Amino acid sequence: MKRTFQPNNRKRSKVHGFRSRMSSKNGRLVLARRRRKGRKVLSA
Amino acid sequence: AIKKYKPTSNGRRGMTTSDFAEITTDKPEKSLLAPLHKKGGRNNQGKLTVRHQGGGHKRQYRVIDFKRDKDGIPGRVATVEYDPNRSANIALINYADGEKRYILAPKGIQVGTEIMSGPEADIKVGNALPLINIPVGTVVHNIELKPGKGGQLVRSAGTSAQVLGKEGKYVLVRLNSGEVRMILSACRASIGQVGNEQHELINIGKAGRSRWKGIRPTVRGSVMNGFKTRKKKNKSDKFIVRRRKN
Amino acid sequence: TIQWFPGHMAKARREVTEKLKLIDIVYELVDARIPMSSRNPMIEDILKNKPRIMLLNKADKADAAVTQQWKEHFENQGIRSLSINSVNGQGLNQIVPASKEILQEKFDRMRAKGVKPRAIRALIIGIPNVGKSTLINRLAKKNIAKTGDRPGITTSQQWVKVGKELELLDTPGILWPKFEDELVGLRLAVTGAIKDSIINLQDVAVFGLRFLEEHYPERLKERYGLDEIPEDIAELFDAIGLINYDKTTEVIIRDIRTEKFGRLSFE
Amino acid sequence: TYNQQEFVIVDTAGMRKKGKVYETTEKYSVLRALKAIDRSEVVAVVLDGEEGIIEQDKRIAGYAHEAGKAVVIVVNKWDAVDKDESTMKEFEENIRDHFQFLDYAPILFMSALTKKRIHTLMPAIIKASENHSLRVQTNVLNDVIMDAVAMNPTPSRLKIYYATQVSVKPPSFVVFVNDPELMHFSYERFLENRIRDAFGFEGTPIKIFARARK
RNA sequence: UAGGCCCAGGCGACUGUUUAGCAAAAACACAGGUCUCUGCGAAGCCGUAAGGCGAAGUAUAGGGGCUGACGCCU
RNA sequence: UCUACCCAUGUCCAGGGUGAAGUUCAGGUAACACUGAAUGGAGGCCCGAACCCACGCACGUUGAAAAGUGCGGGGAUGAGGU
Numbered sequence: 001m002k003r004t005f006q007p008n009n010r011k012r013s014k015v016h017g018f019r020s021r022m023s024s025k026n027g028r029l030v031l032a033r034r035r036r037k038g039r040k041v042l043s044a
Numbered sequence: 045a046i047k048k049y050k051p052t053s054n055g056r057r058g059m060t061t062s063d064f065a066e067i068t069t070d071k072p073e074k075s076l077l078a079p080l081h082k083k084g085g086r087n088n089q090g091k092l093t094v095r096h097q098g099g100g101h102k103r104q105y106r107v108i109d110f111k112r113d114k115d116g117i118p119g120r121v122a123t124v125e126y127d128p129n130r131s132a133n134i135a136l137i138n139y140a141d142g143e144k145r146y147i148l149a150p151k152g153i154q155v156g157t158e159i160m161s162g163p164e165a166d167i168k169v170g171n172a173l174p175l176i177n178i179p180v181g182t183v184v185h186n187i188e189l190k191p192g193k194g195g196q197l198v199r200s201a202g203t204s205a206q207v208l209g210k211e212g213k214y215v216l217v218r219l220n221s222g223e224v225r226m227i228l229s230a231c232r233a234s235i236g237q238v239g240n241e242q243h244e245l246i247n248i249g250k251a252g253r254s255r256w257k258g259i260r261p262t263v264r265g266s267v268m269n270g271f272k273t274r275k276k277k278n279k280s281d282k283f284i285v286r287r288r289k290n
Numbered sequence: 291t292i293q294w295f296p297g298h299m300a301k302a303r304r305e306v307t308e309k310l311k312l313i314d315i316v317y318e319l320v321d322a323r324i325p326m327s328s329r330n331p332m333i334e335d336i337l338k339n340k341p342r343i344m345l346l347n348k349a350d351k352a353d354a355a356v357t358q359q360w361k362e363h364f365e366n367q368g369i370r371s372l373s374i375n376s377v378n379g380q381g382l383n384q385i386v387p388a389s390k391e392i393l394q395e396k397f398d399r400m401r402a403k404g405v406k407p408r409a410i411r412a413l414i415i416g417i418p419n420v421g422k423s424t425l426i427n428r429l430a431k432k433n434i435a436k437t438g439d440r441p442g443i444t445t446s447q448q449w450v451k452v453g454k455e456l457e458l459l460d461t462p463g464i465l466w467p468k469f470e471d472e473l474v475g476l477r478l479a480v481t482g483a484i485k486d487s488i489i490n491l492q493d494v495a496v497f498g499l500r501f502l503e504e505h506y507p508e509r510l511k512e513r514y515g516l517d518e519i520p521e522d523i524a525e526l527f528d529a530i531g532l533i534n535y536d537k538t539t540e541v542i543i544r545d546i547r548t549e550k551f552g553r554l555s556f557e
Numbered sequence: 558t559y560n561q562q563e564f565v566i567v568d569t570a571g572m573r574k575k576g577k578v579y580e581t582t583e584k585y586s587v588l589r590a591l592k593a594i595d596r597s598e599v600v601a602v603v604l605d606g607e608e609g610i611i612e613q614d615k616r617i618a619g620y621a622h623e624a625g626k627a628v629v630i631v632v633n634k635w636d637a638v639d640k641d642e643s644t645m646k647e648f649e650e651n652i653r654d655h656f657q658f659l660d661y662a663p664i665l666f667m668s669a670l671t672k673k674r675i676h677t678l679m680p681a682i683i684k685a686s687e688n689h690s691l692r693v694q695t696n697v698l699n700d701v702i703m704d705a706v707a708m709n710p711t712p713s714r715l716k717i718y719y720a721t722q723v724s725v726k727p728p729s730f731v732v733f734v735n736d737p738e739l740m741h742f743s744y745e746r747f748l749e750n751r752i753r754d755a756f757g758f759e760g761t762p763i764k765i766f767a768r769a770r771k
Numbered sequence: 772u773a774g775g776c777c778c779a780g781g782c783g784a785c786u787g788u789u790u791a792g793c794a795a796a797a798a799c800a801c802a803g804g805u806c807u808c809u810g811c812g813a814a815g816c817c818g819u820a821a822g823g824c825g826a827a828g829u830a831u832a833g834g835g836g837c838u839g840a841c842g843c844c845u
Numbered sequence: 846u847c848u849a850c851c852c853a854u855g856u857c858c859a860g861g862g863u864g865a866a867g868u869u870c871a872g873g874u875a876a877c878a879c880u881g882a883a884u885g886g887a888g889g890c891c892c893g894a895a896c897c898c899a900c901g902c903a904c905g906u907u908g909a910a911a912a913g914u915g916c917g918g919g920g921a922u923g924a925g926g927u
């Protein structure tokens with residue numbers, strides 16, 4: 001049976017990428033929160 | 045006219061098809077073509093607004109000419125072709141000037157006929173004239189509403205209207221649906237009744253033919269566990285002489 | 291011989307007895323082809339102190355003269371009788387007035403007692419494979435009961451409210467637990483009303499052939515594309531063809547119930 | 558006096574919605590109008606024929622019904638709307654669809670302006686006068702009860718033991734049961750229909766009381 | 772490695788679609804029939820609005836209900 | 846990125862059957878519609894592999910597997926699968 005995760009590099013960058021986050025306001029808020037916590041990796 | 049298939053299968057019982065006895069070509073003209081993609085009843089937001097739509101064979105738009113306005117320059121009908129977008133057939137005209145156009149095909153058009161549109165054109169099938177010039181009693185189609193646009197009314201398959209009166213600065217016309225109303229006298233109209241008059245006797249005969257034509261299944265509201273809607277202060281009510289009470 | 295008597299037949303008697311009080315009038319369906327043998331003494335013993343009318347359904351398949359004579363015999367016997375065709379309403383219009391005339395005594399007594407007249411409650415009873423459900427469907431015009439071309443279709447009694455005028459009670463067919471006279475059993479099996487997988491079809495076919503030879507020699511002569519009256523059965527059986535040695539018995543019984551022959555009666 | 562019979566008639570100045578009656582104590586008259594119902598025993602509700610059924614009309618008819626009084630639904634002003642065939646049934650059927658809670662009330666049509674069929678109002682009134690004050694025999698009433706429960710043996714199981722009448726107006730009845738908790742409003746309404754069909758009992762409400770095994 | 776066959780009754784005309792993971796059916800859809808609204812910035816819908824679908828289509832054409840092949844009764 | 850529906854562009858379906866329209870000869874005729882003969886290759890047509898489903902039975906149920914396996918079964922040029 002097909003499991004729910006079928007990896008693909010293009011869609012991952014198009015949806016959870018840095019520029020997609022920076023395009024809208026809520027993505028910028030997400031980036032700000034992740035910077036505040038101090039996570040080593042942010043966006044995707 | 046109408047062809048009946050023999051019952052060689054369960055899905056062919058009672059299926060009837062057209063005859064295509066008024067087609068002289070099978071290839072359109074590259075000049076008068078344009079792309080046309082399919083929408084699924086969605087809109088600019090992507091949400092569904094109209095149900096029972098979507099799918100079907102691909103089509104290409106043919107640029108019809110509903111405005112005419114090519115006065116003088118007599119034209120000769122070159123061919124009559126089938127159009128998938130509308131319910132009628134179209135005709136290609138090679139104007140003597142040189143430019144070719146597409147028009148709706150009225151019933152009775154033979155290849156080689158000479159047509160002409162303008163205030164001095166005579167009364168015969170295929171011509172186009174302002175409503176002032178045409179006399180009482182004629183049958184016309186491709187009615188215009190305001191001068192400068194193109195053929196709003198009565199241009200489907202086998203539909204016709206009639207001229208009744210010539211009251212000043214207007215014309216009394218009766219439409220296909222028993223309506224009687226006045227139209228601005230400077231508007232244009234084409235003589236004759238639209239062809240392909242037997243289009244309404246065709247039996248689809250199968251569930252998949254409507255799928256080909258682009259119609260999706262309809263679910264009754266019961267298992268989904270006479271009020272007039274015309275506006276009551278709508279304009280153009282002063283022009284409606286006799287209502288559509290049928 | 292013939293013994294068919296399942297348990298739902300036994301339960302039907304008890305249910306009818308337990309719901310006897312509500313009944314106003316009784317309709318007793320009786321086949322026209324065999325009017326005397328189709329009566330059920332077992333259910334008649336339970337049924338007493340109640341007015342009733344004899345109905346002769348499937349009257350199109352029987353000879354008119356013998357049915358009318360039997361109608362006279364029932365009438366002068368001391369009971370009302372009628373001839374009806376269920377599939378097409380022939381005598382269905384003249385039963386409501388008869389019921390009204392019969393029950394008028396109690397109706398006027400109740401009316402003078404000071405209450406509004408109410409609906410007539412009728413109970414339909416008879417042997418299986420007779421029109422006790424088709425008649426109800428015709429009377430109600432609704433097609434509400436289940437009908438079939440084999441005995442034992444319905445299994446439980448049911449109330450049907452025909453307008454504000456009638457309340458009908460239906461009932462599965464009932465047969466007496468043990469037969470006594472073999473001729474009656476043979477006639478019943480010929481007419482149907484039995485599962486036909488419990489009995490011997492060869493004896494039924496023999497009885498049919500001998501009755502035909504005795505009564506309708508001309509109809510036996512015409513038969514189906516053959517003209518002879520020999521002493522045995524094997525002459526007619528091998529008309530149209532290893533061929534079925536005696537399975538043709540079914541054929542003999544197949545057409546007769548469908549009236550491939552003309553109308554007849556066994557009386 | 559009408560047909561050698563005396564009568565008393567009272568007007569009530571109309572009634573409007575409770576929410577929008579925020580007047581300057583001029584609505585104090587509505588209390589007077591409500592008082593007349595208590596002293597009256599036959600109620601005539603009047604609806605306009607030119608206008609359709611308004612939601613407030615159903616509410617007003619509620620007060621009369623909850624007071625246990627005979628009701629005769631009346632419509633006026635037919636001179637406005639068309640008088641024709643099947644225009645009788647258009648409002649006759651529509652009233653039944655909307656005014657379900659009262660079905661016993663007879664329906665009368667008359668226009669006061671043109672005085673059409675005005676004299677027919679009293680024939681309705683006198684008939685309604687008797688039914689609001691009527692008693693049925695104890696023997697007969699009981700005999701009808703178990704006929705209804707026999708054909709509908711779906712009351713553990715609720716048991717019916719006795720039935721009789723208490724009041725003349727309106728006709729109250731009490732049934733002795735093993736427990737009144739088993740009584741269902743659907744079944745209680747069922748008993749009323751059978752009683753209303755056994756006899757006339759036209760144009761008057763009926764109330765049924767239930768008593769325990771005692 | 773390759774079709775078991777023959778009779779009699781219901782139900783649904785047929786091919787198809789459904790409760791991923793208990794119910795594949797008589798349930799849904801379907802071709803045909805019928806009622807109702809709509810004269811064009813149409814009627815209906817999505818959006819607070821701008822802006823769109825219907826359609827670049829015009830009453831033999833589009834929305835919304837009820838039934839459900841085709842032969843004999845309504 | 847699983848599943849529901851839609852949009853634009855690609856791609857897949859071993860073999861074998863039945864024989865519609867049309868066309869030609871032609872009893873028939875004055876010629877038909879109807880005989881037959883030849884040609885023709887239509888179908889939400891038939892049998893059946895790849896592919897897609899999931900009707901029956903058995904096993905497994907701290908399983909090889911948090912929906913599988915084995916033997917039978919349905920569709921298989923279309924309202925198809927991807």
Ligand SMILES: Nc1nc2c(ncn2[C@@H]2O[C@H](COP(=O)(O)OP(=O)(O)NP(=O)(O)O)[C@@H](O)[C@H]2O)c(=O)[nH]1
Pocket residue numbers: 347348349350351374375376377417418419420421422423424425436437438439440441442443444445461462463
């Ligand atoms: N020719 C004819 N057939 C009739 C007549 N009445 C009933 N039938 C046939 O009898 C069959 C239905 O009989 P039915 O009334 O259901 O018999 P039943 O007594 O109810 N059997 P059960 O009680 O077990 O349900 C059908 O085949 C119907 O055609 C009639 O008057 N004439």
